[PDB]
Structure 1
Amino acid sequence: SGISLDNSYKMDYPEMGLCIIINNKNFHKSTGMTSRSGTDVDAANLRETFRNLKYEVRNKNDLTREEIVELMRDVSKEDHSKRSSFVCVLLSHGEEGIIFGTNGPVDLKKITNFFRGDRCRSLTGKPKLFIIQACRGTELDCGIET
């Protein structure tokens, strides 16, 4: 054949891949965390958007930290061989490096480590996209007039 350049990920596998959306709106009262009004708007918008890109969208609402970890472990153990890519969207409270389950925090690294190239071999070489709507601390940006 002609010249081959390999500058773009192969996105013509049979399936685009999974789009897992974790939508945490309501937190256990014990945690002190507020309900996240507007997050269902986000989750619905994402489902539509990723549906139109031909992802297999799976939504989960109001997961505990243990449920988040179980979900990601289970998803990482699926056979992704026929999938081009993987997307995970996290909608929750957060701090730098942390996302909240409904009962407490999860380190983001614990979640992403399931998808490392050595631990999820059917995603090795494939793009793994994590979209994170959560705080990363407490700083506020005052902006500048342009």
Structure 2
Amino acid sequence: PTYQYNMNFEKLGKCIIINNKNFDKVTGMGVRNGTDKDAEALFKCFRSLGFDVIVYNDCSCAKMQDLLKKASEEDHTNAACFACILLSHGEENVIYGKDGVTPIKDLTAHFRGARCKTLLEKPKLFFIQAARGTDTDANPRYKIPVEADFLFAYSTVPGYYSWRSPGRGSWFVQALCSILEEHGKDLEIMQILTRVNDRVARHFESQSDDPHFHEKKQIPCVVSMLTKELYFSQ
């Protein structure tokens, strides 16, 4: 209890959702079908958790940057924590805007104590569902502001198939939401996210020798600098 973040605040905090579905053809990236379904789930889910959710769509690089900076400049004094979720295309250390590419570390750095005193000693959660596109990544969180109270959940797992409407949705993202609804108010985040890792990991039906399940195995990556346990409830 002196081992978990103080959640006795006016409000839980803000939850920013960047939903990037469409991209300029100059980037070579295609439509991210299924992203809308993830967005829909996430916002409903975090809303339920008690977050004040904002959803942005098809943002430019400048758009994402000004977006987060401004947020890192608001007064988070009456908030317990802060959450940001990025849904787009990604390449080692980068995420796509519709017009180009920006480094994730710049997107998150805005919230480092130095430049956001109002969220000091407060958990800052980043859930990224990027994925190379149209054998995993690295760990040295250098493409992340290594500072206390920061937590990243990077996917990279692709939303592989999809006919359409409402689309199936990304695995990682749907797992997250599913668990976060059923247990959002009982489990600690690392519990939530560990259950998530497992769930997407199982989607690759173990190590099947069947020429139908043989593929690029992937799993989310959880990076924690949290200094206390995180519960969203009472």
TM-score by length of 2: 0.57
Which residue pairs with 2:61 in the alignment? 65
* 2:26 partner amino acid: S
Which residue pairs with 2:219 in the alignment? none
Distance in 2 of aligned mates of 1:17 and 1:95: 29
State the aligned residue count.
142
For each residue in 1:30-70, what CA deviation from the matched residue of structure 2 results, as whole angstroms up to 9, or x when unmatched?
11111000000000000100011110000000000000000
SS in 2 for 1:132: strand
User: Which is richer in strand?
Assistant: 1
Which residue pairs with 1:121 in the alignment? 117
Q: Which structure is richer in relative contact order (CA contacts within 8 A, separation 6 or more)?
A: 1
1:19-98 equivalences under 5 Å are 19-98=15-94
Cα shift at 1:79: 0.4
1:10 aligns with 2:6: yes
| Structure 1 contact 96–135 (Cα < 8 Å) conserved | no
| Structure 1 contact 21–89 (Cα < 8 Å) conserved | yes
TM-score by length of 1: 0.91
Extract unaligned runs of 5+ from structure 2: 137-156, 158-203, 210-234
Distance in 1 of aligned mates of 2:6 and 2:132: 32
For each residue in 1:79-101, what CA deviation from the matched residue of structure 2 results, as whole angstroms up to 9, or x when unmatched?
00000000000000001211110
1:108 aligns with 2:104: yes
CA 1:80–1:54 in structure 2 vs 1: closer, same or farther (change >3 Å)?
same
* TM-align CA RMSD: 2.1
